[model samples]
Target: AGFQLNEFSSSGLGRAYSGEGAIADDAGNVSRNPALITMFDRPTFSAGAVYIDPDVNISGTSPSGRSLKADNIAPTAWVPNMHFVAPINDQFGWGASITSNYGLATEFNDTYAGGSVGGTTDLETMNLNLSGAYRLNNAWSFGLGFNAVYARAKIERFAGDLGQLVAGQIMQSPAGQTQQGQALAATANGIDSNTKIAHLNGNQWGFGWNAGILYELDKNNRYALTYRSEVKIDFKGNYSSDLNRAFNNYGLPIPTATGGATQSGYLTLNLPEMWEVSGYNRVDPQWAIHYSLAYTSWSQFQQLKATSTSGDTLFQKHEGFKDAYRIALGTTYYYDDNWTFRTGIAFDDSPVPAQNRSISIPDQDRFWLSAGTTYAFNKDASVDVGVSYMHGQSVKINEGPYQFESEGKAWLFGTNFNYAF
Candidate 1:
């Protein structure tokens, strides 16, 4: 359901990453706001990865009163990233980052009872960023950055009538002989083992820009506001399907802009954008706290449509999503010169409304609890490791002719190795 990922920096993640551009503790944090790169006194580099494990449990009934359930459909993912910052002089600096901003991998069993409503949907995006920062004065630093993003998506759904065709046969069969009814329905409907009705594979490249202002309230306190421009993806892809043929024979013509005509061979989709603001305060040498607020413009995602080679609308979905927000607070304790402890909490809103929720995307509000440690081996290098657990609110979904109940949770383990010379 959710696609954006923020676990790019391990040392910063433990505190829910509140400081963002303001902390300027390591190169990894500079990816969120390039201006922070100017805070680096020397050449710096950071590399890290995060492992995400999500538990999504779904259960419900079909429109035809059939029972169904989806177990652990969300797949695990390992996201890797790197950041480098170079100081040209006292007043000028440059940096770059390689990371993933959005990704998803979810799949149901080929024989899932809920396949009629939804099936496999996977998407991935990689971002390459280059930025420059200027130290305006003692109190302010400004930065500008450019992004080149490459993304790919694969989506599929089964024909719902395939099940209805089977259910009808069971209704006609003798009482309590469901197996015989299923067999009869399979034969009548010409059931194929892999009954995929629709499929789309597409890839696209999009571009956006970002800028940030880092204000130093004092030597130990700072705040940053970062704005990332929105980018529209004009995704072009091949779409192949037999749904039109299957439904036409049943007299249930699939609705389309072309008046129930068969639509296949090509398709298109769109994505949205977001921004963030954060602050950091060091009360003393041993204690520090950070906080952040972020927003996502999901409302821009109105629909995902697919068209035939002739530009005829084949499939259209009205997403009608609203904007989403996230708030976080975190604290760190420098136990000694070689060790530090961190902890934080965050609340993240859902992008999908109940009416818009589907088997393909069962999004819900979530709460995050996180903890981590940073170990410094010498003045030039350090390593950070962090862990976070996400608890999602139970969500209910009613889309088209199907109804469902779903709950989800996730865990993230991340590590970042940093070096300065």
Candidate 2:
């Protein structure tokens, strides 16, 4: 539908079992990097799991109390990862691991705005990477690998009442109505609902690669600079049956030959390109610090291009998107070897430029506050639990012929278990 993958974190995500993508250097959790598989000796091995709960409250209004509500929609998920590393002679090592290093999910209220609108939006993601590491001595290592990622999305958007209600500019309105004087009273007398424009449904699928270098800053501190390329998901699916309904019901033609229903088949969408530089610092006895700076070329999310059975389609221009950045700081404090506490904070930028701030994403800048913990019984096995909350600032849009506004918030709770040989 009209929704993009809900990014609760920066870029896909690094395979970190401790909650905030801040895995310890020696912890054998698989990301795309083979060097991460065996940070230590003794056939390093580990396993982990995670769970997330999301809440999105969407609202909008006009000069009066005419408002829309798409609230309390929660999407939940659980992912697990495992890895093992063993030496093959002295200069070579074999590493095998499975982790959900990157993925996302976003589901909106199917009956968003209390039946005032219709459409569904959802995305489910998973990643499986196999890589190998070559130790270049005791303190340096190089890793290479490929990835197979599976992503599923079910997206839809309505183009009737809400579009007009939130549309502030005459040009942005799907109804093609003039933003002149008589327009309000004309639309107010239930005339606006009659000016329906379009409805849609689309999907996406993709695969990409990654590589990295790991440096050992002593046995307790490590630094890694990795780049995970962008994965372009080409979406393909049937058009919304509602488009016909809107046209016919609105007393308008089916809108063919020129546009409208031509977007009835295959489609494509670019997820975004990712870049990151991360570091892990551990204090021998009771403390560890993790910091990460990442960037995504979200502006690549330009338009959702559609193609029909005859290869005739259309482009839905999202003219107001821009790139985004996120900076995160996380740390953990250990109380003995079995119990540990963790927390993190981050500032995330909005990709939805103010001009295109529609109610679907209500895209706005945000901040994340998090807390979690890990319990280790010994060196061979461990378990972890974590949670995070995000707050988004409101965005006010003043466009061609209208005034628009909105806001957002969400929460995530997760857990995992790890083992080593």
Candidate 3:
């Protein structure tokens, strides 16, 4: 499963990431839109954190109607963010930020029915961004940024019924008395272990870039468009397992292509590109409206492959992902010079298809509800707090002889502080 984090700032999160790049309200937008930095006249610094807790449940039914269930396998996380902006003048601005745009952490229950096929994964990513903005005039501004990303991942997958269970199934079949089943059962009777099939861990560094355009149609209306490029990493680490060796030892059939042993090699992973379009409107002194539409090119995430030192293909799998879309709407009430209130709603689409979904990633469409407020202590400082809830549509997976039904929900709490000098 893949994760996209949108909690770079409490302000943007409270509005369900609506105004994002278009608002140009503060330095926190450095991660949202570098060009928005040009809108600030003073040097600014921001710090924030997002706390997330997810509830997920999976129920699996065997062909024989035996059922097993697991609950809350997704772990809680505290994701943090920071940004700095220095407006040298009205025409030029520069800044830097540290962000985690993608991540995943999950540990499945060992007694769950899917445990034989999949188990857990831990993924972490950090991107260091350096950006500059140039205002062509009062009506237009352009921004460019470079990213140095560091990522590491580990996945655990198991082979169900290494030998004995399946061999026993064969022993009761039509051929049990004489040939195939009897020999297999005899061989299985000698084996003494249940083996874990896969354990892969790796880390790498990659680079990418992003650009944006901001246009002010009028004093009260603004629009923004942004693009973030894809990143590719060639990870070098351990990808060894004992399944093939165990099968061969137990006199079970082995795939010829595997070379009948464990392999350690290089793995490749591709991160998706993104496009976002957003707008802001000041309806009056008392109210404002914000909206955004975004797309993730998840279609590019077609495959993850591992290769041997000699360039032999050790493993390959098709992800079969589709592009994902997101839509959001939000509004703010300007209660006074010191207080502002916000609320929003958003819909996020899942890239993975139901048939392709598995215990490793049980994802589906999600709907969001959010609320937040900003307090301006003075012209030089302010703080924001936000809360959000996401509910996912139920999904079903058809894997081998079992059917898995899954549903998920999550809660988000965030707070940020900003200072200007």
The lowest-lDDT stretch of 10 consecutive residues in candidate 2 is: 1-10
lDDT of 3: 0.74
TM-score of each: 0.89, 0.75, 0.90
What pairs collide in candidate 3?
A: none
Better of 2 and 3 by lDDT: 3
Candidate 3 per-residue lDDT over residues 157-260, each given as its tens digit = 54443344556666787777777668867675453333444566788897999898999988779999999888887788765655444343333332112322
Each model's lDDT: 0.74, 0.53, 0.74
Give candidate 3 misplaced runs (Cα > 4 Å): 1-5, 64-66, 160-165, 172-180, 183-194, 244-263, 313-315
- In candidate 1 the C-alpha lDDT for residue 169 amounts to 47
**RMSD, candidate 1, Å:** 4.6
Clashes of each: 0, 11, 0
TM-score of 1: 0.89
Model 3 has how many clashing residue pairs? 0
